[PDB]
């Protein structure tokens, strides 16, 4: 039937992985903090004139359990690597996340999008140029988002689907 795409959302605690996913799926935002154990969602979307089915894994940012990420990185087809533009440490964690995905996939070519979230907030500490440069060095797209305003939310997930498509048909 329609193609299913297995997306996985990763990044440090509090960057907004869940807020982005719930905005995509349920069209709302609450400012409450419900730290994730692990959640799965489904949504069908039209991308480039074709319907497809998104299967989204929303993961925990807990550093304590970093050695338990391997099984979901094996099954996931593409990864949203999320940091918050007002949290420099979350941006520095990105390298460690991408490196872990590369090791588990044993590939330097894994579908991935770098996401700079919370772009509605003032006092940004990670500059857009600094993030675009890093994504350029990885060869992956970079998108700035706000789960609060919905800015870029659809674009982030749709772009990741396009990356997975290109990889499968390569």
């Amino acid at each position: 039937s329609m193609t299913e795409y297995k997306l996985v959302v990763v990044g440090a605690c509090g960057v907004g992985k869940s807020a982005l996913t719930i905005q995509l799926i349920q069209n709302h935002f609450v400012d409450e903090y419900d730290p994730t154990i692990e959640d799965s969602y489904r949504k069908q979307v039209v991308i480039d004139g074709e319907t497809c089915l998104l299967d989204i894994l929303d993961t925990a940012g807990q550093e304590e359990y970093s050695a338990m990420r391997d099984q979901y990185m094996r099954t996931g087809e593409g990864f949203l690597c999320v940091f918050a533009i007002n949290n420099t440490k979350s941006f520095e964690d990105i390298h460690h996340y991408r490196e872990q995905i590369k090791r588990v996939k044993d590939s330097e070519d894994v579908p991935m999008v770098l996401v700079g979230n919370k772009c509605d907030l003032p006092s940004r500490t990670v500059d857009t140029k600094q993030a675009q440069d890093l994504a350029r060095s990885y060869g992956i797209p970079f998108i700035e988002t706000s789960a609060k305003t919905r800015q870029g939310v659809d674009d982030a997930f749709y772009t990741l689907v396009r990356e997975i498509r290109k990889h499968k048909e390569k």
Binding site: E32, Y33, D34, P35, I37, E38, D39, E64
Partner: protein, 164 residues
């Protein structure tokens, strides 16, 4: 100075399951023990009665205590919304340990968890303040309604609670 004892009467979709009692380690963590005691009696005008166990993960723990939002994000202490980690003297040594949930350092409120296994990696991060006295098998019975990510399949509530 005898450590105080409190009880929860647990219900499953409104039907009684049984009573769990806890010893609260006021000898070692008086501020944390007193918070849980007062929340169990409801004497401040709020507390655990009627709240649910929102996260139950078989093999690990049963977590509850969000009586302000009933969604796993809320709760408050008798000292304010949050209070500091009192100490980490006591460890998560096995089933029955009663310990504070938190969202990082110095964020204790009202949420708590009861261990169904030894959870040593939580030592130094969550304040242990009590243990199950009677009714550990009720806590074990609550695991029947949990899941891998903690979502419960029935409404597990504290139908009544108080001090013994």
């Amino acid at each position: 100075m005898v450590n105080p004892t409190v009880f929860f009467d647990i219900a499953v979709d409104g039907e009684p399951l049984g009573r769990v009692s806890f010893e609260l380690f006021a000898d070692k963590v008086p501020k944390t023990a007193e918070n849980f005691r007062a929340l169990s009696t409801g004497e401040k005008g709020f507390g655990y009665k009627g709240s649910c166990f929102h996260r139950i993960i078989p093999g690990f723990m049963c977590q509850g205590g969000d009586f302000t939002r009933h969604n796993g994000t809320g709760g408050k202490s008798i000292y304010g919304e949050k209070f500091e980690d009192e100490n980490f003297i006591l460890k998560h040594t096995g089933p029955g340990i009663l310990s504070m949930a938190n969202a990082g350092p110095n964020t204790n409120g009202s949420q708590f968890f009861i261990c169904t296994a030894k959870t040593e990696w939580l030592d130094g991060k969550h304040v242990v303040f009590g243990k199950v006295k009677e009714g550990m098998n009720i806590v074990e019975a609550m695991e029947r309604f949990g899941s891998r990510n903690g979502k419960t399949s029935k409404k597990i509530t504290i139908a009544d609670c108080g001090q013994l």
